[PDB]
Amino acid sequence: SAVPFHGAHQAGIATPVQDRLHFAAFDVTTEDRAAFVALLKEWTAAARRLTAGHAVGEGAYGGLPEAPPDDTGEALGLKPSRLTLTIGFGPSLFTRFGLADLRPEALADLPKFPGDNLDRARSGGDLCVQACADDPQVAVHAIRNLARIGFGKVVVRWSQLGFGKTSSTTPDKQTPRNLLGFKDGTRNIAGTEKDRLDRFVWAAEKDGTPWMTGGSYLVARRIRMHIETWDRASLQEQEDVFGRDKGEGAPVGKAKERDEPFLKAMKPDAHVRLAHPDSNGGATLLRRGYSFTDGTDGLGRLDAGLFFLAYQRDIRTGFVPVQRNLATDALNEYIQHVGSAVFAVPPGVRDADDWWGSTLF
Amino acid sequence: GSAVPFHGAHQAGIATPVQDRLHFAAFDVTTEDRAAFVALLKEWTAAARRLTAGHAVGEGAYGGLPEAPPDDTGEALGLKPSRLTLTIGFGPSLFTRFGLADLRPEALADLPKFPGDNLDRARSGGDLCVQACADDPQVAVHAIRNLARIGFGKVVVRWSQLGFGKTSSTTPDKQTPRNLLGFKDGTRNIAGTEKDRLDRFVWAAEKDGTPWMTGGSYLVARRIRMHIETWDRASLQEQEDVFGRDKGEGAPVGKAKERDEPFLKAMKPDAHVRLAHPDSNGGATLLRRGYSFTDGTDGLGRLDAGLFFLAYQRDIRTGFVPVQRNLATDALNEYIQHVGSAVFAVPPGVRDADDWWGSTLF
Ligand code: HEM
Numbered sequence: 222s223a224v225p226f227h228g229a230h231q232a233g234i235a236t237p238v239q240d241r242l243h244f245a246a247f248d249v250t251t252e253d254r255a256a257f258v259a260l261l262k263e264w265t266a267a268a269r270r271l272t273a274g275h276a277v278g279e280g281a282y283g284g285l286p287e288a289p290p291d292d293t294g295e296a297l298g299l300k301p302s303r304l305t306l307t308i309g310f311g312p313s314l315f316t317r318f319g320l321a322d323l324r325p326e327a328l329a330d331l332p333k334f335p336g337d338n339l340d341r342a343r344s345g346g347d348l349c350v351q352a353c354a355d356d357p358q359v360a361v362h363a364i365r366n367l368a369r370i371g372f373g374k375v376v377v378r379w380s381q382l383g384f385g386k387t388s389s390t391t392p393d394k395q396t397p398r399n400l401l402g403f404k405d406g407t408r409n410i411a412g413t414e415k416d417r418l419d420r421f422v423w424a425a426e427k428d429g430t431p432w433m434t435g436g437s438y439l440v441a442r443r444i445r446m447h448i449e450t451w452d453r454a455s456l457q458e459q460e461d462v463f464g465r466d467k468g469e470g471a472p473v474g475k476a477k478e479r480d481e482p483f484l485k486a487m488k489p490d491a492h493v494r495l496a497h498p499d500s501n502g503g504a505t506l507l508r509r510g511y512s513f514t515d516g517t518d519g520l521g522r523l524d525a526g527l528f529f530l531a532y533q534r535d536i537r538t539g540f541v542p543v544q545r546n547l548a549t550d551a552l553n554e555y556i557q558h559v560g561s562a563v564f565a566v567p568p569g570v571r572d573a574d575d576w577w578g579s580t581l582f
Numbered sequence: 583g584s585a586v587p588f589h590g591a592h593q594a595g596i597a598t599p600v601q602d603r604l605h606f607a608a609f610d611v612t613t614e615d616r617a618a619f620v621a622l623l624k625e626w627t628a629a630a631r632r633l634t635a636g637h638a639v640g641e642g643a644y645g646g647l648p649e650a651p652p653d654d655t656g657e658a659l660g661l662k663p664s665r666l667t668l669t670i671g672f673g674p675s676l677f678t679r680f681g682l683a684d685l686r687p688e689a690l691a692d693l694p695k696f697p698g699d700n701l702d703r704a705r706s707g708g709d710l711c712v713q714a715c716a717d718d719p720q721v722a723v724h725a726i727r728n729l730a731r732i733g734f735g736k737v738v739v740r741w742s743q744l745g746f747g748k749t750s751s752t753t754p755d756k757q758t759p760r761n762l763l764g765f766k767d768g769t770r771n772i773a774g775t776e777k778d779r780l781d782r783f784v785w786a787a788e789k790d791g792t793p794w795m796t797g798g799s800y801l802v803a804r805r806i807r808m809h810i811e812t813w814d815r816a817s818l819q820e821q822e823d824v825f826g827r828d829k830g831e832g833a834p835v836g837k838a839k840e841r842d843e844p845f846l847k848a849m850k851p852d853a854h855v856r857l858a859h860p861d862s863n864g865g866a867t868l869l870r871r872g873y874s875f876t877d878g879t880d881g882l883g884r885l886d887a888g889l890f891f892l893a894y895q896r897d898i899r900t901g902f903v904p905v906q907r908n909l910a911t912d913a914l915n916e917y918i919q920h921v922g923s924a925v926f927a928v929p930p931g932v933r934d935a936d937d938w939w940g941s942t943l944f
Pocket residue numbers: 399401403404405406407408409442444445446463465482492493496497498506526527529540543544556
């Protein structure tokens with residue numbers, strides 16, 4: 222029911238993927254380094270209470286009547302729900318507090334990509350908090366209360382709700398389907414693969430930025446799907462687009478979902494064939510994204526898609542080469558990237574005396 | 583995880599236990615052909631029979647002819663029914679079409695303007711609605727998406743709302759959820775097992791004046807923004823005074839347990855519970871079935887949170903209208919604003935595998 226908050230790494234990267242997501246990006250409003258470090262300590266203490274299922278501060282009630290409650294209360298009665306809280310620092314953070322020379326070279330600005338249509342209001346951010354849990358209300362309460370505590374030092378720049386499987390009704394041994402109806406996550410780095418995480422996900426000391434050892438680099442892309450167009454495509458177009466069949470998720474010519482793919486049998490611009498590490502010099506990503514449906518836009522269309530999150534040891538050798546290879550992806554007909562951000566995700570909170578960001582400040 | 587039976591004298595999704603997630607869609611009709619619209623209603627009912635049992639619509643999600651689009655969009659394959667219910671309603675604007683003018687129920691009342699209303703006309707009204715409730719949100723969206731797909735060219739989605747979590751209860755034996763203000767919401771509601779209160783306050787009766795509505799209900803939807811920044815800097819006493827119940831237990835002021843009966847004269851004169859209580863409104867009683875929502879930021883550095891309020895009642899004129907009129911002085915008004923609104927007549931249930939939605943109207 223709970224996931225331990227402390228560790229060499231932050232939880233919520235290699236740990237079991239929870240049902241729900243509330244992702245929030247913050248901009249910093251203070252110039253005062255001390256004030257920000259104070260806020261980071263306060264957030265860490267709150268993160269400890271939240272991930273264990275307790276209220277923030279002195280609780281949601283029973284305090285002084287003429288004081289506002291420390292905790293806004295909407296998670297009273299709920300369980301920890303495998304809540305994890307992962308914080309990241311955006312490139313723009315390093316223009317403040319005199320940190321410019323501490324920006325990791327692996328925290329690269331993303332190039333412009335063919336077909337990008339990025340909404341500036343839902344891109345970027347000085348820092349982020351990824352809140353995952355099986356109960357969406359536990360996740361929202363976490364973000365809500367962190368924002369309330371940071372008020373006057375940070376504001377919320379943009380926020381994204383997402384969902385994956387519903388674990389109570391779905392087996393953990395079952396690959397979830399994205400909103401295009403294809404199994405999603407078959408060939409991925411799993412949290413059990415310690416040496417693949419070491420090779421592809423975690424920052425190493427030798428990498429050139431010592432404060433980031435044990436950390437990772439995060440790319441977030443808000444990816445709209447053109448649902449109504451996709452759904453008018455023939456079953457064979459859809460399967461041609463990915464290089465797997467829809468029902469079982471097996472590579473073309475093979476029988477089972479987990480049969481290793483034969484890339485020659487796929488069309489040259491099939492998504493799997495272009496995304497595969499063999500087509501990208503070995504480049505390999507940990508994908509940990511979530512589906513979203515935000516409503517319907519002004520033309521009656523379903524505002525829905527994939528909130529794509531990738532973790533990698535170096536953005537220059539993970540997301541960027543692979544996304545570049547998707548220039549000609551047949552999937553591009555049906556999707557559009559409309560938001561984007563990158564973050565340095567620092568190492569974990571080692572113990573009760575540690576705090577978010579301690580190796581950097 | 584189990585299914586909720588689709589056939590009945592009433593539509594499910596009303597007195598049914600309240601499921602975790604909501605996808606509510608209002609549709610406008612774009613066809614003039616009454617026969618085309620009846621065909622749609624029959625086809626939608628057939629899809630609903632599959633969807634609420636966990637089956638793909640039509641001939642399934644794959645295995646069909648490679649050159650044709652699949653019947654079911656496929657993203658619910660391998661999922662359980664997840665207590666999905668689908669509830670359909672007819673907006674008053676619909677009765678201007680297909681020569682239904684004289685069949686509009688009297689109890690399908692237009693709502694008056696209320697003080698504080700700031701209603702967005704784009705997120706309001708609608709010829710008809712479909713309330714999809716389920717414990718899995720992928721199941722809920724898949725149902726809306728596939729219903730909208732089947733109606734292409736005869737209906738279009740006007741506006742929709744997702745509720746990520748429930749703020750209502752029809753099962754007083756289970757924990758009462760909390761809304762985003764942190765208070766338990768649903769303690770004194772009507773329970774799915776209280777048959778007499780449902781007949782009395784929720785289900786339309788033959789004698790009420792619209793025979794085709796017998797066994798149906800009437801639905802009021804209000805999209806309500808919450809000023810969480812204002813709320814979150816109010817003291818605990820201020821918060822508890824606004825409602826009349828304490829925040830921790832949810833007990834009426836002065837009492838010890840959530841379910842002790844409120845003693846109204848101990849609440850402030852403008853406390854929300856005092857003004858909404860049936861005893862203050864000549865006995866008027868509602869079935870509340872709403873959900874919380876949050877749709878991003880407000881572009882001013884804050885989270886955008888609200889409550890999608892849904893009430894079922896036997897007659898809007900004797901349900902939502904008097905209670906909301908009595909809320910004109912509610913202390914809660916300082917913290918909320920109504921920003922969308924719609925009413926629908928909800929027809930009786932689909933009786934059997936030969937019946938269909940709206941059959942008693944058409
Ligand atoms: C709407 C957007 C996207 C959808 C619907 C989608 C869908 C899929 C599907 C169905 C698979 C096959 C099953 C699996 O192995 O997970 C897959 C594989 C993969 N995708 Fe995507 N994808 C999207 C965007 C992206 C992006 C932006 C990237 C990277 C820049 C990416 C990288 C990959 C990788 C690395 C694999 C594993 C390929 C392999 O080794 O077999 N995908 N994706």
